[PDB]
Amino acid sequence: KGSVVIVGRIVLSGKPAIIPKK
Amino acid sequence: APITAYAQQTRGLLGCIITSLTGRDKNQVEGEVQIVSTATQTFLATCINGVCWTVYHGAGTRTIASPKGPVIQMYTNVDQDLVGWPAPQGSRSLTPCTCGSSDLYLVTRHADVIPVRRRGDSRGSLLSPRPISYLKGSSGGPLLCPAGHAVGLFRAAVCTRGVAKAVDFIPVENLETTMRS
Ligand SMILES: *[C@](O)(C(=O)NCC=C)[C@@H]1CCCCCCCCC[C@H](NC(=O)N[C@H](CN2C(=O)CC(C)(C)CC2=O)C(C)(C)C)C(=O)N2C[C@H]3[C@@H]([C@H]2C(=O)N1)C3(C)C
Ligand SMILES: [Zn+2]
């Protein structure tokens, strides 16, 4: 029985932001 | 502020498999809901009050991979259909609802938050139905009250003809209960 592995994440704590330029 | 969310995939098929056997996850953890995966399926695990809960019919009695190797579950409950491990170092936890709101929101595996009108202790009506393929992988995800606090965890979809009209969930109360048992 293998272990459950975290393959991603969902983040709710993000608040609107102005996508920066690179 | 309104409930908004995003998703970030931290690893792929092969790394996942290796990590499944190896039991050691060295990646960094962020978020309130982890996109969890086994060898058979993928779903969600929500961090509510220091513990990372997920749906039993997905995690079974498996261990979660951590940097310090496999982590044994701290709660298992075949009947409540729940399991829980200590929230991974890095995650942020949600807190249970304390407003008994009946207007809930479901954060899906695709980081989409959809409305569900509470119709009982474990049911809610999708104000705008979706096909089940969409809801796949969302088990163990959170059901937030308008304030963003945990009301429940998505368990099953109430569907017909391949379209989900409603949803069955695990009330935060069963977690607390499962904790004391
Ligand atoms: C999570 O565990 C996952 O996301 N799994 C990862 C990939 C699948 C799932 C989320 C549901 C995904 C959309 C639905 C996919 C089909 C599964 C249908 C099951 N629905 C169900 O049990 N509904 C009940 C009422 N009901 C039936 O009893 C039977 C049927 C087929 C006529 C339709 C129907 O509406 C409830 C009264 C319980 C609501 C379902 O969602 N599951 C069956 C099984 C697992 C979940 C599931 O796969 N959840 C259990 C333990 C409930
Ligand atoms: Zn609330």
GROMACS .gro file of C-alpha atoms and ligand atoms in nm:
model
  256
    1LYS     CA    1   0.000   0.000   0.000
    2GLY     CA    2   0.174   0.314  -0.123
    3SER     CA    3   0.147   0.647   0.054
    4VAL     CA    4  -0.094   0.921  -0.050
    5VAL     CA    5   0.121   1.184  -0.228
    6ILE     CA    6   0.046   1.555  -0.259
    7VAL     CA    7   0.061   1.635  -0.632
    8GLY     CA    8  -0.074   1.987  -0.614
    9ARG     CA    9  -0.237   2.255  -0.401
   10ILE     CA   10  -0.534   2.488  -0.401
   11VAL     CA   11  -0.486   2.827  -0.242
   12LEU     CA   12  -0.773   3.032  -0.103
   13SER     CA   13  -0.564   3.288   0.084
   14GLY     CA   14  -0.480   3.473  -0.235
   15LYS     CA   15  -0.638   3.816  -0.269
   16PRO     CA   16  -0.663   4.007  -0.599
   17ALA     CA   17  -0.329   4.130  -0.726
   18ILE     CA   18  -0.199   4.318  -1.026
   19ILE     CA   19  -0.006   4.053  -1.220
   20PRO     CA   20   0.351   4.186  -1.224
   21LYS     CA   21   0.556   4.228  -1.539
   22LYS     CA   22   0.883   4.044  -1.603
   23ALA     CA   23  -1.351   3.973   0.019
   24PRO     CA   24  -1.500   3.704  -0.211
   25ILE     CA   25  -1.382   3.342  -0.201
   26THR     CA   26  -1.127   3.302  -0.479
   27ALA     CA   27  -0.876   3.025  -0.530
   28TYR     CA   28  -0.610   2.896  -0.760
   29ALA     CA   29  -0.435   2.567  -0.821
   30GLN     CA   30  -0.072   2.473  -0.869
   31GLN     CA   31   0.044   2.127  -0.967
   32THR     CA   32   0.355   2.041  -0.767
   33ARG     CA   33   0.444   1.710  -0.931
   34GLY     CA   34   0.383   1.467  -1.215
   35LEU     CA   35   0.299   1.103  -1.275
   36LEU     CA   36   0.647   0.960  -1.229
   37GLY     CA   37   0.758   1.168  -0.931
   38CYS     CA   38   0.427   1.090  -0.767
   39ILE     CA   39   0.473   0.714  -0.815
   40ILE     CA   40   0.829   0.721  -0.685
   41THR     CA   41   0.714   0.924  -0.386
   42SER     CA   42   0.425   0.684  -0.331
   43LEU     CA   43   0.674   0.398  -0.279
   44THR     CA   44   0.954   0.606  -0.124
   45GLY     CA   45   0.717   0.767   0.125
   46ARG     CA   46   0.939   1.075   0.140
   47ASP     CA   47   0.806   1.405  -0.001
   48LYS     CA   48   1.068   1.677   0.002
   49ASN     CA   49   0.859   1.944  -0.177
   50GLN     CA   50   0.735   2.262  -0.007
   51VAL     CA   51   0.373   2.283   0.105
   52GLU     CA   52   0.140   2.582   0.072
   53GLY     CA   53  -0.236   2.612   0.079
   54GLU     CA   54  -0.544   2.507   0.270
   55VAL     CA   55  -0.634   2.218   0.039
   56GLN     CA   56  -0.384   1.966  -0.093
   57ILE     CA   57  -0.443   1.794  -0.429
   58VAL     CA   58  -0.387   1.438  -0.310
   59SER     CA   59  -0.309   1.130  -0.518
   60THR     CA   60  -0.280   0.753  -0.470
   61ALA     CA   61  -0.186   0.496  -0.734
   62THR     CA   62  -0.551   0.455  -0.830
   63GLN     CA   63  -0.706   0.803  -0.802
   64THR     CA   64  -0.664   1.171  -0.719
   65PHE     CA   65  -0.873   1.396  -0.497
   66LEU     CA   66  -0.842   1.663  -0.229
   67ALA     CA   67  -0.742   1.685   0.136
   68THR     CA   68  -0.846   1.992   0.333
   69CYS     CA   69  -0.656   2.136   0.628
   70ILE     CA   70  -0.900   2.232   0.902
   71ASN     CA   71  -0.758   2.330   1.241
   72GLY     CA   72  -0.410   2.181   1.225
   73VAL     CA   73  -0.524   1.854   1.067
   74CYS     CA   74  -0.530   1.749   0.701
   75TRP     CA   75  -0.862   1.566   0.649
   76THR     CA   76  -0.966   1.372   0.343
   77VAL     CA   77  -1.234   1.127   0.241
   78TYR     CA   78  -1.176   0.768   0.367
   79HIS     CA   79  -1.295   0.605   0.044
   80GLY     CA   80  -0.988   0.755  -0.121
   81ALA     CA   81  -0.703   0.756   0.133
   82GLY     CA   82  -0.815   0.436   0.297
   83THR     CA   83  -0.584   0.368   0.585
   84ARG     CA   84  -0.275   0.472   0.386
   85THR     CA   85  -0.001   0.699   0.514
   86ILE     CA   86   0.073   1.042   0.371
   87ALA     CA   87   0.420   1.102   0.232
   88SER     CA   88   0.614   1.369   0.422
   89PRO     CA   89   0.976   1.487   0.422
   90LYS     CA   90   1.038   1.271   0.727
   91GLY     CA   91   0.901   0.967   0.546
   92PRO     CA   92   0.547   0.819   0.569
   93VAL     CA   93   0.318   0.973   0.825
   94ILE     CA   94   0.067   0.746   0.996
   95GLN     CA   95  -0.290   0.880   1.000
   96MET     CA   96  -0.399   1.034   1.327
   97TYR     CA   97  -0.768   0.961   1.256
   98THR     CA   98  -0.942   0.690   1.053
   99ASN     CA   99  -1.316   0.629   1.058
  100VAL     CA  100  -1.463   0.394   0.800
  101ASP     CA  101  -1.813   0.485   0.913
  102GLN     CA  102  -1.778   0.863   0.919
  103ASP     CA  103  -1.586   0.808   0.593
  104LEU     CA  104  -1.297   1.017   0.723
  105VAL     CA  105  -0.920   1.001   0.772
  106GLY     CA  106  -0.681   1.269   0.894
  107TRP     CA  107  -0.306   1.327   0.923
  108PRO     CA  108  -0.124   1.615   1.091
  109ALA     CA  109  -0.147   1.906   0.845
  110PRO     CA  110   0.180   1.907   0.645
  111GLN     CA  111   0.440   2.160   0.758
  112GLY     CA  112   0.370   2.456   0.534
  113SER     CA  113  -0.005   2.440   0.486
  114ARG     CA  114  -0.255   2.689   0.632
  115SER     CA  115  -0.573   2.575   0.805
  116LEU     CA  116  -0.938   2.675   0.771
  117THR     CA  117  -1.158   2.705   1.079
  118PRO     CA  118  -1.509   2.558   1.120
  119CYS     CA  119  -1.817   2.770   1.049
  120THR     CA  120  -1.990   2.953   1.334
  121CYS     CA  121  -2.274   3.127   1.150
  122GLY     CA  122  -2.477   2.829   1.041
  123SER     CA  123  -2.507   2.979   0.693
  124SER     CA  124  -2.697   2.770   0.442
  125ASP     CA  125  -2.535   2.934   0.139
  126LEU     CA  126  -2.224   2.722   0.095
  127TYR     CA  127  -1.954   2.720  -0.171
  128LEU     CA  128  -1.761   2.416  -0.295
  129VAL     CA  129  -1.399   2.457  -0.401
  130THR     CA  130  -1.335   2.203  -0.674
  131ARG     CA  131  -1.017   2.020  -0.772
  132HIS     CA  132  -0.986   2.273  -1.053
  133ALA     CA  133  -0.992   2.552  -0.795
  134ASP     CA  134  -1.342   2.660  -0.901
  135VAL     CA  135  -1.578   2.767  -0.624
  136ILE     CA  136  -1.937   2.671  -0.700
  137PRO     CA  137  -2.253   2.740  -0.495
  138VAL     CA  138  -2.452   2.469  -0.316
  139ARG     CA  139  -2.767   2.550  -0.113
  140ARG     CA  140  -2.763   2.357   0.214
  141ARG     CA  141  -3.069   2.130   0.217
  142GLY     CA  142  -2.992   1.933   0.532
  143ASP     CA  143  -2.704   1.804   0.740
  144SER     CA  144  -2.522   1.650   0.446
  145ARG     CA  145  -2.693   1.773   0.132
  146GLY     CA  146  -2.692   2.087  -0.073
  147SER     CA  147  -2.832   2.183  -0.413
  148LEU     CA  148  -2.600   2.295  -0.695
  149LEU     CA  149  -2.768   2.625  -0.788
  150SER     CA  150  -2.626   2.552  -1.133
  151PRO     CA  151  -2.572   2.175  -1.194
  152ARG     CA  152  -2.256   2.037  -1.347
  153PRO     CA  153  -2.175   1.704  -1.509
  154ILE     CA  154  -2.011   1.448  -1.275
  155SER     CA  155  -1.685   1.435  -1.474
  156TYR     CA  156  -1.633   1.792  -1.354
  157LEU     CA  157  -1.681   1.702  -0.987
  158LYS     CA  158  -1.440   1.408  -1.018
  159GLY     CA  159  -1.133   1.454  -0.802
  160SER     CA  160  -1.313   1.698  -0.571
  161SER     CA  161  -1.374   1.448  -0.285
  162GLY     CA  162  -1.234   1.572   0.041
  163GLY     CA  163  -1.258   1.932  -0.080
  164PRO     CA  164  -1.405   2.208   0.138
  165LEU     CA  165  -1.758   2.351   0.161
  166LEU     CA  166  -1.716   2.710   0.277
  167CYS     CA  167  -1.984   2.936   0.429
  168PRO     CA  168  -1.987   3.294   0.288
  169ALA     CA  169  -1.714   3.376   0.538
  170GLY     CA  170  -1.471   3.111   0.409
  171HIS     CA  171  -1.500   2.877   0.703
  172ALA     CA  172  -1.535   2.503   0.675
  173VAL     CA  173  -1.891   2.372   0.680
  174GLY     CA  174  -1.814   2.037   0.528
  175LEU     CA  175  -1.611   1.812   0.301
  176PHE     CA  176  -1.744   1.700  -0.040
  177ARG     CA  177  -1.809   1.326  -0.034
  178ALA     CA  178  -2.038   1.215  -0.313
  179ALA     CA  179  -2.236   1.362  -0.597
  180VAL     CA  180  -2.615   1.335  -0.625
  181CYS     CA  181  -2.633   1.271  -0.999
  182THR     CA  182  -2.862   1.132  -1.269
  183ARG     CA  183  -2.792   1.087  -1.643
  184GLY     CA  184  -2.437   1.193  -1.567
  185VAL     CA  185  -2.528   1.534  -1.427
  186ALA     CA  186  -2.495   1.634  -1.062
  187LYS     CA  187  -2.792   1.822  -0.927
  188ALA     CA  188  -2.684   1.798  -0.564
  189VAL     CA  189  -2.396   1.696  -0.338
  190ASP     CA  190  -2.353   1.483  -0.026
  191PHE     CA  191  -2.095   1.604   0.227
  192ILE     CA  192  -1.940   1.541   0.571
  193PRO     CA  193  -2.041   1.818   0.823
  194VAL     CA  194  -1.752   1.969   1.020
  195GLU     CA  195  -1.921   1.825   1.326
  196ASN     CA  196  -1.835   1.471   1.220
  197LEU     CA  197  -1.469   1.569   1.212
  198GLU     CA  198  -1.482   1.699   1.569
  199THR     CA  199  -1.678   1.386   1.666
  200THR     CA  200  -1.429   1.162   1.482
  201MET     CA  201  -1.158   1.344   1.672
  202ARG     CA  202  -1.301   1.264   2.014
  203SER     CA  203  -1.360   0.900   1.914
  204LIG     C1  204  -1.467   1.156  -0.475
  204LIG     O1  205  -1.433   1.041  -0.396
  204LIG     C2  206  -1.367   1.169  -0.590
  204LIG     O2  207  -1.356   1.282  -0.635
  204LIG     N1  208  -1.299   1.066  -0.639
  204LIG     C3  209  -1.191   1.081  -0.737
  204LIG     C4  210  -1.233   1.035  -0.878
  204LIG     C5  211  -1.358   0.975  -0.900
  204LIG     C6  212  -1.598   1.129  -0.555
  204LIG     C7  213  -1.659   1.258  -0.612
  204LIG     C8  214  -1.778   1.234  -0.702
  204LIG     C9  215  -1.741   1.262  -0.846
  204LIG    C10  216  -1.865   1.283  -0.931
  204LIG    C11  217  -1.955   1.161  -0.930
  204LIG    C12  218  -1.887   1.042  -0.994
  204LIG    C13  219  -1.976   0.918  -0.989
  204LIG    C14  220  -1.987   0.860  -0.848
  204LIG    C15  221  -2.131   0.861  -0.799
  204LIG    C16  222  -2.148   0.843  -0.648
  204LIG     N2  223  -2.268   0.911  -0.603
  204LIG    C17  224  -2.342   0.867  -0.502
  204LIG     O3  225  -2.305   0.781  -0.421
  204LIG     N3  226  -2.458   0.931  -0.492
  204LIG    C18  227  -2.559   0.898  -0.391
  204LIG    C19  228  -2.698   0.891  -0.457
  204LIG     N4  229  -2.677   0.812  -0.583
  204LIG    C20  230  -2.657   0.678  -0.575
  204LIG     O4  231  -2.661   0.620  -0.465
  204LIG    C21  232  -2.632   0.599  -0.684
  204LIG    C22  233  -2.652   0.653  -0.822
  204LIG    C23  234  -2.531   0.604  -0.903
  204LIG    C24  235  -2.786   0.606  -0.876
  204LIG    C25  236  -2.645   0.803  -0.830
  204LIG    C26  237  -2.674   0.879  -0.701
  204LIG     O5  238  -2.694   1.002  -0.709
  204LIG    C27  239  -2.554   0.977  -0.258
  204LIG    C28  240  -2.685   0.957  -0.182
  204LIG    C29  241  -2.443   0.919  -0.170
  204LIG    C30  242  -2.529   1.126  -0.280
  204LIG    C31  243  -2.030   0.904  -0.573
  204LIG     O6  244  -2.013   1.027  -0.572
  204LIG     N5  245  -1.953   0.821  -0.501
  204LIG    C32  246  -1.981   0.679  -0.476
  204LIG    C33  247  -1.887   0.640  -0.365
  204LIG    C34  248  -1.787   0.750  -0.344
  204LIG    C35  249  -1.837   0.867  -0.424
  204LIG    C36  250  -1.731   0.933  -0.510
  204LIG     O7  251  -1.677   0.872  -0.602
  204LIG     N6  252  -1.698   1.057  -0.477
  204LIG    C37  253  -1.884   0.711  -0.231
  204LIG    C38  254  -1.826   0.636  -0.116
  204LIG    C39  255  -2.005   0.794  -0.199
  205ZN      ZN  256  -1.952   3.063   0.889
   0.00000   0.00000   0.00000
